[PDB]
Structures are given as structure tokens and as C-alpha cells.
A paper describes a structure:
We first measured the enzymatic activity of 12 mutants and found that eight of them (D137A, [name], H176A, F179A, E236A, R240A, Y242A, and Y242F) almost completely abolished their activities, H279A mutant retained approximately 65% of the activity compared with WT, while mutations of Asn243, Arg272, and Tyr322 to Ala only negligibly affect their activities. Brønsted base is responsible for proton extraction from C-5 atom in β-elimination reaction. Two positively charged residues Lys141 and Arg240 have their side chains pointing closely to the C-5 atom at the +1 subsite, hence are potential candidates for a catalytic base. Our structures showed that the [name] mutant possesses an active site almost identical to the WT, similar to the Y242F mutant. In contrast, Lys141 possibly functions as a catalytic base by capturing a proton from the C-5 atom at +1 subsite. Subsequently, abstraction of the proton occurs on C-5, a process that is presumably accomplished by Lys141, leading to the formation of an enolate intermediate. While it remains considerably challenging to unambiguously identify residues responsible for proton abstraction and transfer without structures of [name]-NTD in complex with substrates or products, we were able to infer from our crystal structures and docking models that Tyr242 and Lys141 serve as the potential Brønsted acid and base, respectively. We found that the inactive [name]-NTD mutants exhibited similar Kd values as the wild-type form. These binding assay data clearly demonstrated that while our inactive mutants lost their catalytic activity, they maintained their substrate binding ability.
Residue numbers in the entry: 1 to 443
The structure:
Amino acid sequence: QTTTVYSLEDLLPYLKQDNVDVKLAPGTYNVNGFDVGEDRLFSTTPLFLFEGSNSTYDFTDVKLNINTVVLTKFGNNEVNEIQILGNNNVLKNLKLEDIGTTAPSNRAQSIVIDGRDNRIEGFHLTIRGSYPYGYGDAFGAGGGSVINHRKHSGVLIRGLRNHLKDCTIISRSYGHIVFMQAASYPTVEGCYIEGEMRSTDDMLAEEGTGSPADKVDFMTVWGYKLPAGYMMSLQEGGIRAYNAGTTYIDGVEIQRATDNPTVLNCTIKNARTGVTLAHANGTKYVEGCTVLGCENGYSIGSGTVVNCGADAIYGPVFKNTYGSDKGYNADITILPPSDAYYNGHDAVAYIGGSNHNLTFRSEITEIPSNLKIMVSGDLQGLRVLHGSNPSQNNFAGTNIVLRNLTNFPVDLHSDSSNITVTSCDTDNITDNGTNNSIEAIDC
């Protein structure tokens, strides 16, 4: 009792219905500007609004191309390609691609998951169309921007017990790739998440062209001219949780923080951060992940990161978010470089807050001269130089267990205290803190 349909026009009615089992015939389906409007197939945004419950949709060998001009076809309103509002739905195997480079009139999300107990599996997403594209967040990702933005993010997970599984999410757009707002018990599992990078030196080479960055003389939102020597993502977070948001379950509007997020066996590459769950409440659990060439590896604030790896070519594998972080437990492998080193942060980890149990493993024997494990101190972080974002730099660290099973050096700043350090070698450890103990071990 599986119904097969052969066009987007024949598909749309089933999106309103409960308990359906629908298949969209293999093929390549184009949505264009001429397809959006009053008499046209799509008169409202979101384009594909899944309102029914207990339904399954098969998109095997479906290619769905959406021209980015569609993001300008609904006025000054947010545009979403896919939004799920019902419960207990399963969508599988869709290949979806944004065509062109037109930015939203307002902003856009490819996929938004409200409701409860939904699952998207096997999707292959390619996200395009945003402004500005090519600077990451250097000229603004929020209010008071130097260059006003019209962002386009990938998958927004909200709702309750919603599940993103075995998907591939490629972003070539300024926005988060996967993020969570007001999501309770979200799970991201088995996914490949990929952005692209650009050095600040390359951006600075736009001088004299009349580019948007040139017209503001490269003055960042952080308060200083864009510094040379860093690698940025052109995207925002790889997997990022927010401590607020709006979601809709059973028609009821809800405003709440993300809580109890789980991330399992994902690979994140070339994003501003691999996994950042520090703003979520509840239990944060990250296991089996691989983060390559991100500006920041893991920042969950408090919780567990276990059996995870990250390389350190563009930024630290580990960072505490604020000086108030408490109970971050982590076992992170520093992986072999996935590309040439270009790390202006001068750190493999920045540690502060209290009551952390931290283990770093690595087989690296060629240690770049600028890379070290920092407990407290003045991080040379791209966004925290010269007193900017001061709550995210220069904080104290106390009552922390640090197992340095690597050849990287450790610098314990004067603001650190009661740090118990276990290291392969103790000769490359600087201790300027109070009541810290340094004990060597074999291997």
C-alpha cells in the first residue's frame, strides 16, 4: 500500500495527510522562479511543508534542484525549503541541491524539523545562496553588523526527539550547516558535514577592488582590522546548539533552550566549529566523532566527549566557552593533519573554568612550534584579540585533571590553580600557576 507519484504537483497533497506511505518516482525535478507564485505550484513558503503524522516518504534516486532565486520570491520573509510540523514521520534518500548564488531577501533554511519523533535519513544536501559570502562572520553574524547579512543555513533541528541520521550536508553558504534551536532530545548520527575555508590573508588581498570588505577597509565586527594569518570557514557552526528558540509541537508554540543533545559518529569538516553544544541544557553527549580542519574542534561546555578526534591545522581541538564552564569531560585524539597547518590561534587547546577531566591522545611527533595546550592565559584567538569578546578569553582555571598523552607542550598560566597534570614528558611543561602538580608517565 505504497503510493507512487511522478511530479512535485502530485506530491504536495500527501504532505497534508496522516498515515501515508508515499514514493516519488526516480528523476530530476527542478523548482525555478517561474514555479513560485499565485497560479504556480508553490504559492507559499515553506515549499514542502510536512503537516501530517505517521507518514513515510521515499525519495530514493530523486534529485531535487531548487534555484536560489526562489529565496527572493516571497518578499522580506524567511524561506524554508522543507519544514516538518507533524509527528512520527520518516523521510529518506532525497538528494537536494541549491542552484545559483542568489541570496535570500531575508534569510533561509534548507530543512527545519519541528514536531516530535521525526527522522530524516540518507539525505544528500548542497546549500547555496547567501550574503555576504566569502568572509565568514568577520563583518557580522548577528546585530550591529559591519556588512548586513542575509544568511542561509542547512538543517535546523527543533521539536522533540527529532533525528538526523546518515545524511551528507555540503554547505557553500554563509550560515550554520546543522544547528539546534528549542530542540529537546535531538540526535545527529552518522552524518558527514562539510564547509569550505578561506584565509584572512586571501580576504585582505581584496584591497583596491571595491569589494564589500574593501569598502569598510576590512574593519571587523570584533573592533579591529581583519588580522593576517588565520584560516576561516565560510560557513558558521558544523553542529551548533542554541540556548533559545521557537518550536511547534501539536500546533503549540514553544520557546525554550535546546536540551539533551546527542551527537554520534559524525564527521565535520571545514566549519567554524566541529561540535558546539555549550549553550544547551541537560545532558550533552558526543561520541565517535571526527572533526577536520575546523576553526574549533569540540566546545560542549559541560558533559562528555568520548572517543572523538580532531586535527589542529586551523584552530584548537578543545575550547572552554566561558570562565564559568564546569564539568567538561573529554577524551580527544589530536589527529594527523588533514592539510597544511595554518593555525593563527597558537594553541591546540584552551582550558579554563573548573572541575574538568581532560585527556588528550596523539601519535604526532612533528609538533609545530606555535602549538601548545593552554590552561588559562591570553589566547591568540581570531575573535578574542585586543580585548574583544572578553568573556571568552583570559579566564581562570581551577581543580582540573589534565592527562596529556601527547608530545604537545603545556603552559599553565598564572591564573591557573589546583591543576593535576599527567604528561608523557614533563620537560616541555611551564607551570606559572598555584598549587599545580606535574607527574610524568610512560607513553
